[PDB]
Amino acid sequence: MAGDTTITVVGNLTADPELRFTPSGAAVANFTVASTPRMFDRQSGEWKDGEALFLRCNIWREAAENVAESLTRGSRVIVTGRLKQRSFTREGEKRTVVEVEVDEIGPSLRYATAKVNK
Amino acid sequence: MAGDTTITVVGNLTADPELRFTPSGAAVANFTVASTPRMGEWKDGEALFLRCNIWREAAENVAESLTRGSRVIVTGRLKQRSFETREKRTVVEVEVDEIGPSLRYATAKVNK
Amino acid sequence: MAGDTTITVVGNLTADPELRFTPSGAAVANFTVASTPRMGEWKDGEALFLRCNIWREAAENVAESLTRGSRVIVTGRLKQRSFETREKRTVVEVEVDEIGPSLRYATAKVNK
Amino acid sequence: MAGDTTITVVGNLTADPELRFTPSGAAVANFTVASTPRMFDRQSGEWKDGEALFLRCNIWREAAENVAESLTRGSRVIVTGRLKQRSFTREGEKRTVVEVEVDEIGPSLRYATAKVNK
DNA sequence: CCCCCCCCCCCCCCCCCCCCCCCCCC
DNA sequence: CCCCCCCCCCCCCCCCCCCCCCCCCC
Predict the structure, then answer these.
(1) Domain SSB, which positions (chains A, D)?
(2) Distance of CA D67 to CAs B88, C71, D51, Å?
(3) Helices (H), D1-118
(4) Closest approach of chain C CAs to the CA of B59, in angstroms?
(5) Where do the domains of chain A lie, and which CATH numbers do they carry?
(6) Looking at the partner chain, which of C1, C10, C49 has a beta carbon nearest the beta carbon of D1?
């Protein structure tokens, strides 16, 4: 219970956001946030980056057009949304992946600057 | 590149916590939290099922305190994992940091 | 402009939960979660103290199940509030959605 | 326990980010996120926006310069960080406010587009 | 610390993003 | 379902951001 399960992710888009449409004209954007744990000593005596988390994201409407206009592969982003499960297909009788249904996203300003325009 | 992705989940254990032991003898408890959105409105909207892992002393306490159907509050960090299983799939799991039975519909006698 | 700001807090009740009743007779429980960062490293880094509010049946269960020093997992949404108090200050508080005693150092007998 | 208490906030800066410095040259930016619950029926029979949450934020280093270069009063932002208490002063024997120590922030792309440049 | 669910209202108690300054501002 | 804390490993169970499509990609 307690409504949906929300989540915030920070990471980089593994690719350019795929923008697609509905016969009525509603935009939906799809992309994946690769989240790599930095300074997460895991293997040998030394230290570096840890294994990565890849979450596929969905976003709709105006924001979808903005996501596609504003972001590309490699962009560092801050994302909030809610985790949704989906039963997917072809090679997998009744597949199932988790996905984030985005509420808000933006390019992080840790290593980059940004011009904000409507 | 960015810390550990945290998550809080509230829901019900789909079963009793499976308790096991790692090679060095670390107590590990596994279980799955079924999270159902209460939600013209629907009722039984699409539930979310997350597999959880928890270690050491807490694993023992979870195994001693919780059962199938227990409503729980869980915080931890999402981790992705791959696994062969007869020559390989990839599932997201929660590495639990804290978990407790929820007090919304129940009372609890804590043994500190 | 943006939904309700949620928060999860883990820590210890600074005292026993104060139970009270609203004019219509709604059960409301208040208490404060002291959250201490474990942390060349320090030890008793600056603790965070958050006042919590919880309502109805859960308030009763909290008051029946929890005491000063109980370690708890809490989720809710941050709310700001102003108050006269002898002609006015403004404090942030958590409106609890779920709370439970943590199973990290303790076991719990849930009464579903 | 469990390390720090993290938080994600979405909202608008009540003002332009105040940028300041340290004798050594480290940038720190301060600003406040006004978070207004939208579609949160509270008073009369009708519905609209609910009462607002104002959290003062702190951010350091490079990001602080980027925040100050990129954002202004009214900007909608996504913020993640950790809640910190502080004992503040003048008119208040030993004051105390909560504050967010920002880890990442960015302009939300719900109602705006953005050019990302390093 | 259990009196029927509309809104009492104070931030004080134990080895699962860490080096650095202002009054809560629709 | 309690065998000493390094890493077993499957997403299946009840009135506190809601109108809309792909294989987990450092």
Answers:
(1) 1-109
(2) 43, 37, 26
(3) 61-70
(4) 8
(5) 1-118 (2.40.50.140)
(6) C10
